[PDB]
Amino acid sequence: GIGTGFPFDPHYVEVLGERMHYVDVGPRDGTPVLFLHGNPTSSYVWRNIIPHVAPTHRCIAPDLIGMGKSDKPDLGYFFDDHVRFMDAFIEALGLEEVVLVIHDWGSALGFHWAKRNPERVKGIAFMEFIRPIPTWDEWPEFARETFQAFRTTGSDQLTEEQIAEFKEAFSLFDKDGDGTITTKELGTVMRSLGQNPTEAELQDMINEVDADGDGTIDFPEFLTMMARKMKDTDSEEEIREAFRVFDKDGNGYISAAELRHVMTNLGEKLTDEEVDEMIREADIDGDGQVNYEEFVVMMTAGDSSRRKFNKTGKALRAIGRLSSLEGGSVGRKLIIDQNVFIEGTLPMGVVRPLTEVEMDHYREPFLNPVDREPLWRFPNELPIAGEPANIVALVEEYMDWLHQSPVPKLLFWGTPGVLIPPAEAARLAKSLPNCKAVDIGPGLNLLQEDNPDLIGSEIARWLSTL
Numbered sequence: 448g449i450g451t452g453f454p455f456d457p458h459y460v461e462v463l464g465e466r467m468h469y470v471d472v473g474p475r476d477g478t479p480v481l482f483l484h485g486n487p488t489s490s491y492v493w494r495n496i497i498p499h500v501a502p503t504h505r506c507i508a509p510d511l512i513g514m515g516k517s518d519k520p521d522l523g524y525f526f527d528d529h530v531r532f533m534d535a536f537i538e539a540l541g542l543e544e545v546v547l548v549i550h551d552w553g554s555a556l557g558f559h560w561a562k563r564n565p566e567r568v569k570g571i572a573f574m575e576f577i578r579p580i581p582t583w584d585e586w587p588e589f590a591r592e593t594f595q596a597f598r599t600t601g602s603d604q605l606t607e608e609q610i611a612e613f614k615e616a617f618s619l620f621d622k623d624g625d626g627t628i629t630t631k632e633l634g635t636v637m638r639s640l641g642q643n644p645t646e647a648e649l650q651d652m653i654n655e656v657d658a659d660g661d662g663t664i665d666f667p668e669f670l671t672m673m674a675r676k677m678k679d680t681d682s683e684e685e686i687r688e689a690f691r692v693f694d695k696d697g698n699g700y701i702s703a704a705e706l707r708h709v710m711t712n713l714g715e716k717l718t719d720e721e722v723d724e725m726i727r728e729a730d731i732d733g734d735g736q737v738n739y740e741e742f743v744v745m746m747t748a749g750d751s752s753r754r755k756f757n758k759t760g761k762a763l764r765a766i767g768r769l770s771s772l773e774g775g776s777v778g779r780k781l782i783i784d785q786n787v788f789i790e791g792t793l794p795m796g797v798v799r800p801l802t803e804v805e806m807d808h809y810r811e812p813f814l815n816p817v818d819r820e821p822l823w824r825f826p827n828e829l830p831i832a833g834e835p836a837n838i839v840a841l842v843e844e845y846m847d848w849l850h851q852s853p854v855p856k857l858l859f860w861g862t863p864g865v866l867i868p869p870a871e872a873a874r875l876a877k878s879l880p881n882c883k884a885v886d887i888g889p890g891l892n893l894l895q896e897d898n899p900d901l902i903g904s905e906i907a908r909w910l911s912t913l
């Protein structure tokens with residue numbers, strides 16, 4: 448009967464203009480034991496391990512910024528964001544000597560902080576920590592296809608001039624060449640095409656595909672929107688809508704003046720006789736106009752004026768695709784909207800079935816879809832296949848620090864595991880200094896939920912070694 452209650456007095460502290468939350472129970476003197484959680488949990492993952500440590504040693508378990516009960520500022524929640532907030536939080540409490548019990552992304556925070564302050568770390572307990580992996584073949588194949596979906600957004604085999612066609616469509620919006628599409632500069636062409644959305648609608652279309660966190664639209668974010676998922680009918684609403692932009696009078700034909708207007712409304716070079724040559728490749732029945740079925744031809748096909756037309760067609764199609772509010776990153780819609788990281792990824796991290804009262808505590812901090820930004824930034828920050836480069840070099844530095852650090856190290860592993868397999872858990876037991884490895888038997892990622900009895904057991908005995 449594994450307990451699920453959370454009977455800890457909550458404490459709060461402001462850090463960098465935002466407020467954070469932490470548990471603080473235990474004797475007030477000695478060396479504090481700092482618990483650091485990872486994705487997608489909070490302090491709730493340490494609820495049945497603190498009682499094994501709380502009597503003898505002080506236990507501090509904060510929730511990361513934008514998670515648990517800490518404040519949720521509008522940030523990208525990169526790893527460097529958590530470093531800045533955890534750095535100022537540790538010094539806000541005036542801590543010096545510290546013992547670290549870390550897991551998942553909390554281990555990346557604890558180890559990186561220990562490398563920069565090695566004279567202030569008395570002991571490190573850890574399990575399923577962040578490690579560099581060279582190939583996707585080393586990542587467990589049960590979650591290899593899914594964790595790719597969080598990071599396979601954009602660059603879906605777009606080659607030749609396809610990237611060069613979207614960059615010309617990207618040029619229709621960027622008049623100041625800032626590389627980013629301003630929330631007003633988008634509306635500058637929305638008004639220029641006969642429309643006029645609200646400011647709420649203007650930024651809502653950007654809040655769908657802003658993975659950078661700039662609040663604006665990037666070109667890599669412009670590519671992930673233009674996916675090749677061409678449903679025969681569901682994608683007919685955007686080409687038909689592209690036809691409505693030209694056909695203003697609604698008679699069913701695109702006039703030469705209707706064609707020249709929207710193109711010259713934006714930045715294009717078409718005089719009175721520069722538009723007749725693309726009428727040739729469009730007008731096939733000879734009526735001097737372009738109907739609907741002739742229009743889908745040019746939108747599905749020497750680029751004298753073909754370059755000019757296909758350029759705008761890409762931009763006009765992105766307008767209708769932005770208005771769909773479904774042109775976001777595929778990995779984002781899994782974690783943000785559909786919330787697959789709490790509904791599917793989190794339970795698959797524990798081999799035993801989590802209870803409804805248990806997982807309900809995990810849904811609590813992320814009841815708003817917009818507040819799930821760190822839930823999606825964390826998997827994209829994983830050092831996998833040498834990407835991201837800044838994270839790989841960062842984790843490969845505190846691992847080089849850990850190989851030579853004489854501090855006591857307590858490692859917990861399980862079978863089959865996710866981040867630390869049994870094969871790697873055996874090498875770390877024989878390669879790291881002062882390292883004793885404890886096997887919990889069955890275990891994946893959240894080793895705290897499978898055997899919280901054993902985790903707090905060996906830690907308690909390991910605490911009294913210093």
Ligand SMILES: [Ca+2]
Pocket residue numbers: 620621622623624625626627628629632
């Ligand atoms: Ca711009």
Ligand SMILES: [Ca+2]
Pocket residue numbers: 627657658659660661662663664665
């Ligand atoms: Ca951006």
Ligand SMILES: [Ca+2]
Pocket residue numbers: 627659661665
């Ligand atoms: Ca940018």
Ligand SMILES: [Ca+2]
Pocket residue numbers: 694695696697698699700701702705
């Ligand atoms: Ca017309």
Ligand SMILES: [Ca+2]
Pocket residue numbers: 729730731732733734735736737738741
């Ligand atoms: Ca025609």
Ligand SMILES: [Ca+2]
Pocket residue numbers: 655772773775784
């Ligand atoms: Ca959405």
Ligand SMILES: [Cl-]
Pocket residue numbers: 486825826829
């Ligand atoms: Cl993750």
